[PDB]
Write a protein that binds this ligand. Structure first.
Ligand SMILES: C=CC[C@@H]1CC[C@]2(C)[C@@H]([C@H](C)CCCC(C)(C)O)CC[C@H]2/C1=C/C=C1C[C@@H](O)C(=CCO)[C@H](O)C1
Lengths: 233, 11
């Protein structure tokens, strides 16, 4: 029972994603180059990657049906708190179970100033999400639902946010019933929501370690202005 | 505090 509106929403989110996610990595050439030899020698490259990814996430967010109805303040609140989660989510598309320059591993992320306190559960997240083998329709709906979360700190019009998210969540639940055949569909929605819960935890830890990194001006120096504005300064 | 860049990107 996929309504015409729901199909519209899926069409919109797929296109919005195709316009903000380039799997060819063409733009990665414009980043400060990665350095593998190395104390924080990957920070410049990954910082640029995150800054870029935030720009792309913002472009995706604005194309979310209903999102434009929120106040700029509430749009800001949602993007500031979700940015890191949506980047972790969208990264899964490139995350491989098996250019080698732009193929990142544990030691790469470590050379950006992060520890296994984050990295381990991040890989666990990426492996578990990958196993769900989502349809791209489900992939883009999950990212949108993540962005439009009523419970983000600093949200004023929580009822509006919730109503937008509900439209999206109802669209996800219905899509899975009608389009995703079993066994692959078993509890799929509940598992997709669990991932959002996993992302809160990853968000939490990244914020802590980012605070340790960005405390030394020498490291803060290696970040970008957008990353400083969104993640904090 | 204020988010000039984030604001500008959200049009
Ligand atoms: C297992 C994760 C792989 C990779 C390495 C580490 C990243 C940057 C994670 C780190 C914890 C963030 C570190 C950022 C810092 C400011 C230093 O704290 C977040 C997303 C992760 C990653 C993201 C990868 C992307 C590539 C591609 O899928 C992509 C876009 C293609 O245009 C995404 O936007 C970002």
């Amino acid at each position: 029972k996929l309504s015409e509106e729901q199909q519209h929403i899926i069409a919109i989110l797929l296109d919005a994603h195709h316009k903000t996610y380039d799997p060819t990595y063409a733009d990665f050439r414009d980043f400060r180059p990665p350095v593998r030899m190395s104390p924080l020698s990957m920070l410049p490259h990954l910082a640029d990657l995150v800054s870029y990814s935030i720009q792309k996430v913002i472009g995706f967010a604005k194309m979310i049906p209903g999102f434009r109805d929120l106040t700029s303040d509430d749009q800001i609140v949602l993007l500031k708190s979700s940015a890191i989660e949506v980047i972790m989510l969208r990264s899964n598309q490139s995350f491989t179970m098996d250019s080698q320059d732009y193929k990142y591993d544990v030691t790469d992320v470590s050379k950006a100033g992060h520890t296994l306190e984050l990295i381990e559960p991040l890989i666990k997240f990426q492996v578990g999400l990958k196993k769900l083998n989502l349809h791209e329709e489900e992939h883009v709906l999950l990212m949108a639902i993540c962005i439009v979360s009523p419970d983000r700190p600093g949200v004023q019009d929580a009822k509006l946010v919730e109503a937008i998210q509900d439209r999206l969540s109802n669209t996800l639940q219905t899509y899975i019933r009608c389009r995703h055949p079993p066994p692959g569909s078993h509890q799929l929605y509940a598992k997709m929501i669990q991932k959002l819960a996993d992302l809160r935890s990853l968000n939490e830890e990244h914020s802590k370690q980012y605070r340790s990194l960005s405390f030394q001006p020498e490291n803060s120096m290696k970040l970008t202005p957008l990353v400083l504005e969104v993640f904090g300064n | 505090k204020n988010h000039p860049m984030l604001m500008n990107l959200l049009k």
